[PDB]
């Protein structure tokens, strides 16, 4: 059982509960005043994980109930954080975030991530952060942090890590992404080169590896998204960073009489019930879901010639149409 | 067979198995050569190798007998190497005058037995074993004297007889010596007269690079012995081998009782030890010399008809364009980067004046931009072509590391000067990763190099200003609008100093990314690698002999023609700093160095400016 235990870890430790007297002293107590200790017997730690499993024996069966119905993508999509109403697109993408892949190795070699980086903008409501508690609950090796919050020394590793190092190979989640000040933003600005942090300070020359994914919930410049201001004005963030984000979901709220009825019906229905979907959808349990995603990450697909060319042409059209729009 | 206790490594068996181990290369997959070196010096301490016995047969098992039972095996090994010295001498008859040289003490110093994982991983089940360890040394303790042969006395008569310690205990006879006399009275132990042997103590952190993070590393005190004592100082991160030991400690206080939890330390029997064609002007003497005593090879030689091909290709008008596509075949578009670097290969013209002068040909290039832009790939390629260049990462660097190490040689146990990384890089091209990220003390080296073109070392042993003349190609990763001059970070004075500073930016190409994707998304297919940029006309080995030829046989001068346009460019920029001018006149002369022109045209200074303006068309945003 030795070395099984590691610092900072909640664990149910079972064992015979015993004294080991007294070594003396022996004058002071008097007596005998045992003071005891716990002999370890068994060890069960809370919170033990894909991508590592061999089989894929009869567990595929547990995947198939999910597959056979077909339209897995929309099904799972909806099945992420059903607790909130709307934003099927946002969730639609978050499924991808959880899945990730495929990166690449150029054989020389250097790497290209490798993963997805999501932002969620808009304010004050729309419940953006609940999606992040959601994800960091579903994904293993997920970690939820906030700016003031998680200190700069929170993400970097001291010599005696946290956040980014603590959660890597899996999704990291950030709230209040504006208030994080400066030194933090440099870390995160760099981590989109993936595979890196570099700590040159004092007793540390190391460069540790963070394979982290990042999801960042942020609020537009005060108060909320002033439409008389251009984008990038009401987003306080520099363009050096946003180029890194592949998908920025800006969630803006304009009151709509029809829809908000539906919403209110939802948030009244639950509370009133615990289980949200009825007539009809089947919410996919996070456990089996994690299994499916686990079986997903194993594939490493490759592009055909036709989709490539298509991507290119559509990219020229997207560039040209974006710039013809004007500054 | 003479079984020995529980170690069960038999005497008069393994001795012979080791005795016929002699004279082997063999194998491998030295040995007697190094021993024959050993016999003269009288240094003793045979360092061995390990691994030798593995996979070699016989003594495949001896490796396991030593690894599992090093205690006896080292003693037997020493006896056997001693008697193999004795058998070495009789072969040459009378040696060294005569038998006294054999009497001198010898020992084996085994090392590198398997690769052990840390101190931390270690089981309590292996307490007699050879164990690698690594970590810095926090302190070297003062020398404690260790009993070897004990001395004794009595009130009667007094008599001088004494007994050796052997095992880690001391038992003196109650009564008595010589004779007799007797009486029962307690023995008088002289403290100072008896013999002693050096035992240091060395604290070692467990591999601070390998840690639970954040828990502070665990101490390992390795006690050494003999010659090894006082052979080290502190902070040495390298490695150490030796036998693990658990010995009881006396606790509270007094009482003569054992704490029953044995402390653990390492015997550490061994310790082991530390941590395109060249230009003419640079060669100089080795041309002016090496002719007299003669020699062969050196400067690359060219046939006639291929020369006749170069002087033909020079005629081709698109040449300046052509070579630019030929440099990086894998790398797509971004032609002006390829191009500026193309001139980095031809850079400048060297000038000695009467004396001094020496502006060389050096031209220096930083380039920054969005990640995954191939900015590192170029570094690799230039590194591959340039004959003498050296490739350094950020933070893997220090001002001591870039010149003048003054290390101990460890072969001769002497102090020898080593060339730093910039001194090596003298001539050709130093390549730098992540330049933005260098520590603040570093970059203070570069203000010396970039200007002076030499480095001045007054430190430590030898005080001199030594020459490093080298190009620099630096990569940078920045932290629309914003001040750009702000957004490269850097102190702006250093930043203005770089000859040509590239900023990667969208060229509005559409119309590019498709082409580039055609390039990279290949391989891909075909799986086999054929061509690459095809169909594109490309030189391959021709461009290197071309570049070389250009460099040695051409020495361009601006003449009356550059200066007008040359200046008006600088003013046009001023309407920055004077370095930008220096830049232009050097960079341009590279262009003119190409095309085989001894004199610059008034033309060709146009693009020579435009390259500096190229980044400006990229500074618009």
UniProtKB/Swiss-Prot annotation, chain A:
Signal peptide: none annotated. Changing residue 128 to A: Loss of MCM2-7 complex helicase activity. Residues 72-268 form the MCM domain. A motif (Arginine finger) lies at residues 243-246. It is found in: Cytoplasm; Nucleus. ATP 1 binds at residues 85, 125, 127-129, 219. Acts as a component of the MCM2-7 complex (MCM complex) which is the putative replicative helicase essential for 'once per cell cycle' DNA replication initiation and elongation in eukaryotic cells. Core component of CDC45-MCM-GINS (CMG) helicase, the molecular machine that unwinds template DNA during replication, and around which the replisome is built. Present with 166 molecules/cell in log phase SD medium. Early fractionation of eukaryotic MCM proteins yielded a variety of dimeric, trimeric and tetrameric complexes with unclear biological significance. Specifically a MCM467 subcomplex is shown to have in vitro helicase activity which is inhibited by the MCM2 subunit. The MCM2-7 hexamer is the proposed physiological active complex. Belongs to the MCM family. This is DNA replication licensing factor MCM7. The lineage of its organism: Eukaryota, Fungi, Dikarya, Ascomycota, Saccharomycotina.
Curated annotation (Swiss-Prot), chain B:
ATP binds at residues 369-376. The keyword Nucleotide-binding applies. Signal peptide: none annotated. Keywords: ATP-binding, Cell cycle, DNA replication, DNA-binding, Helicase, Hydrolase, Nucleotide-binding, Nucleus, Phosphoprotein. Residues 319-521 form the MCM domain. It is an enzyme of class 3 (hydrolase). Acts as a component of the MCM2-7 complex (MCM complex) which is the putative replicative helicase essential for 'once per cell cycle' DNA replication initiation and elongation in eukaryotic cells. The active ATPase sites in the MCM2-7 ring are formed through the interaction surfaces of two neighboring subunits such that a critical structure of a conserved arginine finger motif is provided in trans relative to the ATP-binding site of the Walker A box of the adjacent subunit. The six ATPase active sites, however, are likely to contribute differentially to the complex helicase activity. This is DNA replication licensing factor MCM4. It comes from Saccharomyces cerevisiae (strain ATCC 204508 / S288c). The lineage of its organism: Eukaryota, Fungi, Dikarya, Ascomycota, Saccharomycotina. The gene is MCM4.
